[PDB]
């Protein structure tokens, strides 16, 4: 499937306050009026998506079907993978290559090989409400920007604020999404039929090196942008 992205996917690039000014920045952005791939979070078996240069991940749902993400080069124990799991209590981020199967297990509570967990992080969870995230990894740091906005994709403009800047220095080239369901059987492999679940949808777009012209109002917030 395909669907065009409106003037969406911008973020604060430098966390430097500017008041009522136009600034030209060359960085990794999602080009305006570009198509983004669409997936339904009910059934199709979960495709693996490459992490080329950065990912814009949008989610629309009302049942908390998806609860995390997996990053890394391979699902085996040879490369130190990264795992982010959200919950109703807190968010847990770990980097020790949890051994996944041919498809990552759907969150027999622990199923992994030996671990070498060096980096772990806990904070408040990322709680119709469209949730937009940008995941980037360029200079040995892994950056997550996000915004939760009330309500396919509207024409309104909203800039993503920086949430997390992790210091882990692993190489990320592939990623997936993490789904959850209560009383769900766990199997190494299942077909695309899946099981019935709540209605949800998520969009994936890719970041490219582009020049943008951002406008800052008197309150220091980005209110409009121009794709150069």
């Amino acid at each position: 499937a395909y669907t065009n992205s409106f003037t969406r996917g911008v973020y604060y690039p430098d966390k430097v306050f500017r008041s009522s000014v136009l600034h030209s920045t060359q960085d990794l952005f999602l080009p305006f009026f570009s198509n983004v791939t669409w997936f339904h979070a009910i059934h199709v078996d979960n495709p693996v998506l490459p992490f080329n240069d950065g990912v814009y991940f949008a989610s629309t749902e009302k049942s908390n079907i998806i609860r995390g993400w997996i990053f890394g080069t391979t699902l085996d124990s040879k490369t130190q993978s990264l795992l982010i799991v959200n919950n109703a209590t807190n968010v847990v981020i770990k980097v020790c290559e949890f051994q996944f199967c041919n498809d990552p297990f759907l969150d027999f509570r622990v199923y992994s090989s030996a671990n070498n967990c060096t980096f772990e992080y806990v904070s408040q969870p990322f709680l119709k409400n469209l949730r937009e995230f940008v995941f980037k990894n360029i200079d040995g740091y892994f950056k997550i920007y996000s915004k939760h906005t009330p309500i396919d994709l509207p024409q309104g403009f909203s800039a993503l604020e920086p949430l997390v800047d992790l210091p882990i220095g692993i190489n990320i080239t592939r990623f997936q999404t993490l789904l959850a369901l209560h009383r769900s059987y766990l199997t190494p492999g299942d077909s695309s039929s899946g099981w019935t679940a709540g209605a949800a949808a998520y969009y994936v777009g890719y970041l490219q090196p582009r020049t943008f012209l951002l406008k800052y109002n008197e309150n220091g917030t980005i209110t409009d942008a121009v794709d150069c």
Partner: protein, 145 residues
């Protein structure tokens, strides 16, 4: 550099100056002080459940652990251990207050006094050969009380 008139004579390179206004030099007040400002950050690494516990790992199970993502000032210790052998290798005490690294791995064991010599770099014996082996190259501080 005696008076402004002498400076004017310098600028014009003449002992007689004519009536008017002359731009002689520039001035700048003082940097009357120097201040360094650093954060209200206070997360510290949990050095207290490692150095105080009511039990420690026996050598066969040697309890490794990981200290991560925290300001660590290795000054919290040097408080209660009359360390028989602090013996730090290569880092030395003051410099590490300064440096920054990805993780610090703290392992804990209980070995009798005669064997405390063996838990060091390059020693051979029952303890360092069948029970815990420090690597040939090390930047770390064995501490024993």
């Amino acid at each position: 550099a005696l008076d402004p008139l002498s400076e004017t004579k310098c600028t014009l390179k003449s002992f007689t100056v004519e009536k008017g206004i002359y731009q002689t030099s520039n001035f700048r007040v003082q940097p009357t002080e120097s201040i360094v400002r650093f954060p209200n950050i206070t997360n510290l690494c949990p050095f207290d459940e490692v150095f105080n516990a009511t039990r420690f790992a026996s050598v066969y199970a040697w309890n490794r652990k990981r200290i991560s993502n925290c300001v660590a000032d290795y000054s919290v210790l040097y408080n209660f251990a009359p360390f028989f052998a602090f013996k730090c290798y290569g880092v030395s005490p003051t410099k590490l207050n300064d440096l920054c690294f990805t993780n610090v791995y703290a392992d804990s064991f209980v070995i009798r006094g005669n064997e405390v010599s063996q838990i060091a770099p390059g020693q051979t014996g029952n303890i360092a050969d069948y029970n815990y082996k420090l690597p040939d190259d090390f930047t770390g501080c064995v501490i024993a009380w």
